């Protein structure tokens, strides 16, 4: 009767709904009883420090478990042959065949083999021994403690920040651009130049010697003379064996481009020069805003003055400053949309341009990292649109936003939504129709009749960056071009070697199957956007429910009247778009993984011929690659893919269990539960035990969430088991 102490409406509920709803509304601090704005921003600040610490404890845990139980020192000796160990297994349910089957990695105990790539990342950035992985784990435990104490400290009465501090947009932007983005990128260049570059070249540099070991033989004298090009002189040779002194140069900043020939990763001197460039740029960008000394920009002044004189945007951005600052949901939506695009950039640029030594030969790690970050990307992008819907319901004031960009977006909400409906339908009808055309014609024994459309626009883009496969002779592909001549002395020789060589995932060859799947991804991104945009724009009202704002973000329905109002809330369009997010990241990761496993065999033509129809995707990707995974255990034994073999079935179960919450709805279950309440009260020896909370069926919104969680968890666990076990079992 007092668990949701933040909610008296839930704390007086006599049912089991109180526990569920108190657990599910716990982090929605804005909705808590008697919540002021001061207390809202100060609890968010302290709980952001708790998230900071959880991240640091998670990273310290990965470092500790690899330092303790991993084979990092064995792996760094021979990184292409040794399989990295994540942590050991102590499971009292194992049989002795299971214990023997997981005893890989060169150790004497069962282990999980790491798919996270942390070995390649820690190898590349300098770590050599278990002592420094452990030292990193210790330092992160200290930092986690520092940020937990900071979270407690900024909850103390003298140390409580005011709302004037929390909304100082200019000082926060100045410091996050110049200190958090820029100076830490500059400090990361210092780590590469001072530690990672020398230790990639055999010379150990630690805290014990880094003030008496110069990164460059000349040493901070060329920098303080303008002779900066002396830091690019004598780069690492193509004969360099990573981690050793043979083939090593003395340069610490280069723009060679392409990849280190042995590790098949970006040059660490390119990465050090990248973070130096991006650091200075971000530091300069962090001097943009006026704080205390009269130079800089006021964000209010910039936003108010950007109204085009033609009047096409109305009042423009007048009043957008206040809306953004006052609305934490508008900020969360901008932050999550921005972050979601970046983790999609992270997934796309880390497989094509890997930075870590001897990764991109760890095919399981490449598949897991790409799949992981694309799923994180889809979650962040859907959440951005969710919090835009929450912004419109909760924080958007139409009077304060008269004729703005925001009001005028709502004014044409139907033009936006109907054109997203058109483009979704357009793409879906044709992409599916071309795929079905191809399936029917191939089935009828006539593969030639297939509508195979070359991806010429993308091929032109590849050629424009120097791919010579398509013979476009555009820009970099043409030897005598202004673009080619300009970059010839700096990054083009390495880039042309990297792009033209077929040993890397840089600008991988694209054909008709690639075109069709890209259009499928376009239908998926447009359809998820349609559902999310329809939810955000119709969040505050619709013809079916004009006063939808008055009911909130997440409500079940408005009842069976007016024809029926199931899934009418903006939350329910989040709910419906979550399936479309899962479907699109499914199409993306299925495409990435199938194209890569076919290239990794040396059989890229198998994707080229089978991806243009859907039975090729069914038999040649899902059915063909299932066999190492589903044979992880059988009546003839088991091997170390048994865990993924069990997880794959576990994902199928959770996913299907989600269907129970999504297909079967409340009234059936409340009528079951009332017969169980009768039976418990009428059973002798059992009616001595009484519930404190009346058993009720799950709510309409709660069951939609429970089915969505089960569907999503089943989706993730099934695909993670498949993408890891098929790649591990195949090794290619």
């Amino acid at each position: 009767t007092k668990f949701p102490k933040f909610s008296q409406a839930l704390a007086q509920d006599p049912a089991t709904r109180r526990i569920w709803y108190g657990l599910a509304t716990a982090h929605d601090l804005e909705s808590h009883d008697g919540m002021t704005e001061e207390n809202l921003y100060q609890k968010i600040f302290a709980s952001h420090f708790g998230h900071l610490a959880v991240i640091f404890l998670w990273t310290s845990g990965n470092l500790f478990h690899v330092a303790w139980q991993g084979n990092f020192e064995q792996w760094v000796l021979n990184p292409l042959k040794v399989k990295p160990i994540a942590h050991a297994i102590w499971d009292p349910h194992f049989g002795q065949p299971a214990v023997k089957a997981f005893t890989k990695g060169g150790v004497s105990y069962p282990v999980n083999i790491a798919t996270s790539g942390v070995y390649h990342w820690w190898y590349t950035i300098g770590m050599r021994s278990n002592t420094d992985l452990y030292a990193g784990s210790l330092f992160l435990l200290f930092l986690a403690g520092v940020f937990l104490f900071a979270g407690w400290l900024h909850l103390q009465p003298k140390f409580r920040p005011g709302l004037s501090w929390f909304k100082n947009n200019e000082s926060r932007l100045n410091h996050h651009l110049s200190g958090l983005f820029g100076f830490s990128s500059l400090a990361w260049s210092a780590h590469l130049i001072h530690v990672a570059i020398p230790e990639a070249r055999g010379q150990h540099v630690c805290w014990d010697n880094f003030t008496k070991v110069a990164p460059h033989p000349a040493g901070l004298q060329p920098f303080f003379t303008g002779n900066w090009g002396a830091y690019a002189a004598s780069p690492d040779t193509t004969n360099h064996i990573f981690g050793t002194s043979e083939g090593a140069g003395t340069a610490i900043l280069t723009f060679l481009g392409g990849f280190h020939p042995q590790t098949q990763a970006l040059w660490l001197t390119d990465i050090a020069h990248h973070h130096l460039a991006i650091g200075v740029v971000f530091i300069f960008a962090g001097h943009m805003y006026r704080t205390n000394w009269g130079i800089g920009h006021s964000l209010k002044e910039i936003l108010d003055a950007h109204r085009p004189p033609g009047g096409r945007l109305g009042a423009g951005h007048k009043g957008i400053f206040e809306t953004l600052t006052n609305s934490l949901h508008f900020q969360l939506g901008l932050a999550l949309a921005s972050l979601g695009v970046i983790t999609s950039l992270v997934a796309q640029h880390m497989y094509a341009l890997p930075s870590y030594a001897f990764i991109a030969k760890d095919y399981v790690t490449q598949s897991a990292l790409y799949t992981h970050h694309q799923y994180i990307a889809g979650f962040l992008m859907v959440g951005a649109f969710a919090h835009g819907a929450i912004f419109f319901v909760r924080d958007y004031d139409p009077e304060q936003n008269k004729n703005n960009v925001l009001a005028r977006i709502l004014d044409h909400k139907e033009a936006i939504i109907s054109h997203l409906s058109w483009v979704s339908l357009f793409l879906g009808f044709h992409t599916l129709g071309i795929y079905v055309h191809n399936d029917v014609v191939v089935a009828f024994g006539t593969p030639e009749k297939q509508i195979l459309v070359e991806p010429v626009f993308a091929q032109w883009i590849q050629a424009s960056s120097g791919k010579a496969l398509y013979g476009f002779d555009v820009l970099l592909s043409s030897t005598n071009s202004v673009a080619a001549n300009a970059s010839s002395n700096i990054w083009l020789p390495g880039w042309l070697e990297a792009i033209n060589s077929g040993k890397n995932s840089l600008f991988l060859p694209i054909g008709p199957g690639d075109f069709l799947i890209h259009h499928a991804i376009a239908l998926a991104l447009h359809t998820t956007t349609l559902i999310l945009v329809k939810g955000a724009l119709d969040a505050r009202g619709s013809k079916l429910m004009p006063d939808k704002k008055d009911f909130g973000y997440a409500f079940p329905c408005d009842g069976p009247g007016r024809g029926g109002t199931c899934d009418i809330s903006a939350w329910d369009a989040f709910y419906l778009s979550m399936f479309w997010m899962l479907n699109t990241i499914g199409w993306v990761t299925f495409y990435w993984h199938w194209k890569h496993i076919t290239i990794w065999q040396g059989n890229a033509g198998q994707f080229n011929e089978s991806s243009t129809y859907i039975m090729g995707w069914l038999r040649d990707y899902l059915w063909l690659n299932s066999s190492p995974l589903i044979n992880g255990y059988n009546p003839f034994g088991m091997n170390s893919l048994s865990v993924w073999s069990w997880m794959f079935l576990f994902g199928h179960l959770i996913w299907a269990t989600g269907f129970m919450f999504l297909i079967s709805w409340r009234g059936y279950w409340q009528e079951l539960i009332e017969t169980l309440v009768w039976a418990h009260e009428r059973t002798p020896l059992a009616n001595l035990v009484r519930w404190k909370d009346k058993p009720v069926a799950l709510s309409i919104v709660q069951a939609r969430l429970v089915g969505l969680i089960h569907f999503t968890a089943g989706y993730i666990f099934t695909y993670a088991a498949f993408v890891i076990a098929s790649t591990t079992g195949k090794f290619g």
Binding site: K43, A46, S47, F49, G50, A53, L57, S60, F64, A67, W68, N130, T131, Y134, S137, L138, L141, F142, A144, G145, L148, F149, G151, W152, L155
Partner: peptide, 30 residues
């Protein structure tokens, strides 16, 4: 390799982090 003493130092620092986590959680809960 990592000593048992080194693991115990890590466990000491994680206990200190646990106590600071309890103190932050109680402060956030009020």
């Amino acid at each position: 390799m990592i000593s048992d003493t080194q693991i115990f130092i890590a466990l000491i620092l994680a206990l200190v982090s646990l106590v600071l986590a309890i103190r932050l959680g109680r402060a956030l809960y009020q």
